[PDB]
Design a protein around this nucleic acid. Structure first.
Length: 107
DNA sequence: AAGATAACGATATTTA
DNA sequence: TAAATATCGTTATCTT
């Protein structure tokens, strides 16, 4: 239902190695039920970087505050200043961390 | 049961 | 103007 899986993800690494990082249309011939750019989205957010060992540090948290209000939601450009995390990873984590940063009013 | 992460589709923007 | 690209946004699934 949600498409993809580990078996297909492993094939991605092989496909990217053989087809390249632009001929995603070739992969779209084997997988048509997905946006071609999304196949790249996974490669770029899983096998390309090393988004692990916890998120960013508080130093980045307070830095990203400014490194965002200057270049809108250009996470694509922000990930370049923080050599370690990618788009769908930072965006996800930003909204995630914001849920804790924004506190929780009650009484 | 609730929370967190991941992935796929679409919209908006940019370039051709 | 049309097409192509990237990030965004939401839901589903999985883990704790």
């Amino acid at each position: 239902k949600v498409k993809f899986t580990e078996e297909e993800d492993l094939k991605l690494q092989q496909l990217v190695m053989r087809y390249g990082a632009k001929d995603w249309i070739r992969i779209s011939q084997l997988m048509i039920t997905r946006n071609p750019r999304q196949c790249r989205e996974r490669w770029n957010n899983y096998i390309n970087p090393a988004l692990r060992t916890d998120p960013w540090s508080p130093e980045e948290d307070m830095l990203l505050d400014q490194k965002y209000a200057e270049y809108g939601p250009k996470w694509n450009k922000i990930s370049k200043f923080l050599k370690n995390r990618s788009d769908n990873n930072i965006r996800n984590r930003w909204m995630m961390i914001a849920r804790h940063r924004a506190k929780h009013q009650k009484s």
